[PDB]
């Protein structure tokens, strides 16, 4: 996260770290959506152009964390993966369209002060909140700058951007399964996700029921916190029918 701040304790209890077993390293962010299911970006698991294709046994998820590098004894919980599900129409060849994946845990994780699931949006909450100017929040342990790494989880609040502005910022083909967020050059404030934040959540707090909803997944960008560029996020509601189908079938 670039130009963010240290998270408060328990501020993002759905935040998950995807962790490589060997060598031990951060792979991506992710989010807890139930006691058995973790949501992330497909590109965190499958990206052939970079020779990336992880299987269940390559990975662990670490839940309840604050410190990036420490083993947070008595606080974090570490889970093995039972199965990975990648969206069947994930477009890794072109533009990361439908950049979404689910991971089912081998065993349910115990909820605590530091571990708790985020909500997925219904159509109405999505329609109400996914509007240009409305701010969401991105969290992660990724790089602090494009070209270093944080001691603890970082947080930044960023406004959703008008779709024509998103489109005009980039040569990459954008789709309805994406939205973009970030400040414009003239707005003064800044901030963005960066490498390592991939797969983590873009959340919004509904003013109707005071609950946090995950509207986006950190998906792609060009650099980090560049003027005139914006971060692009998987549109979680647009892909919720797939999420529901996987959970119903394999849950």
């Amino acid at each position: 996260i670039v130009e963010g701040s240290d998270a408060e304790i328990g501020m993002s209890p759905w935040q998950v770290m995807l962790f490589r077993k060997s060598p031990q390293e951060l792979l991506c962010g992710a989010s807890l959506i139930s006691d058995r299911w973790v949501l992330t970006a497909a590109h965190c698991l499958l990206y052939p152009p970079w020779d990336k294709n992880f299987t269940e046994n390559d990975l662990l998820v670490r839940i309840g964390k604050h410190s990036r590098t420490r083993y947070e004894r008595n606080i974090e919980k570490i889970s093995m993966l039972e199965k990975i599900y990648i969206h069947p129409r994930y477009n890794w060849r072109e533009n990361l369209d439908r950049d979404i994946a689910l991971m089912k845990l081998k065993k349910p994780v115990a909820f605590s002060d530091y571990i708790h699931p985020v909500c997925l949006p219904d159509r109405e909450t999505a329609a109400s909140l996914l509007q240009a100017g409305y701010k969401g929040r991105v969290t992660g342990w990724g790089n602090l700058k494009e070209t270093g790494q944080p001691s603890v989880l970082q947080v930044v609040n960023l406004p959703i951007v008008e779709r024509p502005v998103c489109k005009d910022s980039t040569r990459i083909r954008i789709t309805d399964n994406m939205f973009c967020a970030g400040y414009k050059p003239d707005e003064g404030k800044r901030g963005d996700a960066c490498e390592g934040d991939s797969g983590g959540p873009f959340v919004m707090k509904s003013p109707f029921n005071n609950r946090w909803y995950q509207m986006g997944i950190v998906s792609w960008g060009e650099g980090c916190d560049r003027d005139g560029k914006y971060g692009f996020y998987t549109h979680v509601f647009r892909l919720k029918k797939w999420i529901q189908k996987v959970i119903d079938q394999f849950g």
Partner: peptide, 28 residues
């Protein structure tokens, strides 16, 4: 879950985090 999106250390105790008000103010 019925309890999704309500944080044990914040919503559950009626405590606000340092910047959530920034989000609320943008929801016009």
């Amino acid at each position: 879950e019925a309890d999704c999106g309500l944080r044990p250390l914040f919503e559950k105790k009626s405590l606000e985090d340092k910047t959530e008000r920034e989000l609320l103010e943008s929801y016009i």
